[PDB]
Design a protein around this ligand. Structure first.
Ligand SMILES: NC(=O)c1ncn([C@@H]2O[C@H](COP(=O)(O)O)[C@@H](O)[C@H]2O)c1N/C=N\CC(=O)[C@H](O)[C@H](O)COP(=O)(O)O
Ligand code: NA
Length: 241
């Protein structure tokens, strides 16, 4: 499936650029209109929607639960949400607000003992392991936010039933240069029991086509949709052919 993505800061749909320390900088504001954007995405056939709560990421005390509740209610397609999910209570709050899947990167690589417990409480279908991948000079898929590889972390969670992984090539985020096809070809084949979502870099319709047959189950598209490189409708018809 095609998975359209929005970044949210205090109710605003934003463009950000990832910085060194896991930090980032706000580039563009697209508007204060997340719900109509999501409804248009759904109307065009998007089967899943992706939201990153950057406000909650900075400060979990400020998680945008009331907004998320409204956004989930206002469409009839499942929404997955990430952003500074740190505790079992955070996961529960998001599911209670009507989120279909909770997306977790930082806490999952930092505190595997804790997050394993979440798998056992909520079940594997409720949780998406998000991997912020940096390929180093040696070819290692680094995912720390000492080092941790993609493979090491996937293996960490397979025993508690890991099924969904969002694999972001963070150097590709917002570049419009294409997603990392070879990376997805490799990891999808290595873990055929896992449903990988690709993320970062989609630039034009050819880039969607290029991920067909890689094994990727979901293609996250952010910037290209926001800046009208193509519509959700045509992304879907490319992806489904
Ligand atoms: N500074 C950041 O931007 C950022 N930091 C963490 N995440 C993710 O937040 C989640 C939870 O992280 P954590 O549990 O808080 O550590 C993890 O997945 C982290 O990887 C980010 N992603 C934000 N938007 C991503 C987005 O809108 C589309 O994916 C992107 O525009 C698609 O690429 P494209 O435009 O099409 O090139
Ligand atoms: Na689709």
């Amino acid at each position: 499936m095609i998975i359209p993505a929005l970044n949210l800061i205090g109710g605003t749909v934003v463009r950000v650029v990832r910085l060194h320390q896991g930090d980032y900088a706000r580039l563009r504001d697209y508007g204060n209109d997340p719900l109509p954007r999501l409804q248009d995405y759904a109307a065009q056939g998007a089967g899943v929607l992706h939201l990153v709560d950057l406000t909650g990421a900075k400060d979990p005390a400020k998680r945008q639960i009331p907004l998320i509740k409204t956004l989930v209610a206002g469409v009839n397609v499942p929404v997955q949400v990430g952003g500074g999910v740190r505790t079992e209570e955070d996961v529960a709050a998001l599911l209670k607000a009507g989120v279909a899947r909770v997306v977790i990167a930082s806490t999952a690589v930092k505190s595997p003992d804790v997050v394993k417990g979440w798998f056992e409480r909520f079940g594997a279908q409720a949780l998406v392991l998000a991997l912020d991948v940096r390929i180093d000079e040696h070819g290692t898929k680094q995912v720390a936010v000492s080092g941790v590889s993609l493979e090491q972390l996937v293996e960490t969670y397979l025993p508690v039933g890991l099924k969904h992984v969002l694999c972001t090539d963070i150097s590709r985020d917002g570049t419009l240069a294409g997603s990392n096809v070879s990376l997805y070809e490799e990891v999808c084949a290595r873990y055929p029991q896992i449903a990988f979502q690709s993320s970062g870099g989609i630039g034009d319709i050819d880039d969607i086509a290029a991920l067909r047959g890689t094994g990727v189950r979901g293609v996250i598209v952010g910037r290209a949709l926001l800046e009208g490189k193509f519509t959700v409708k045509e992304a879907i018809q490319c992806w489904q052919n």
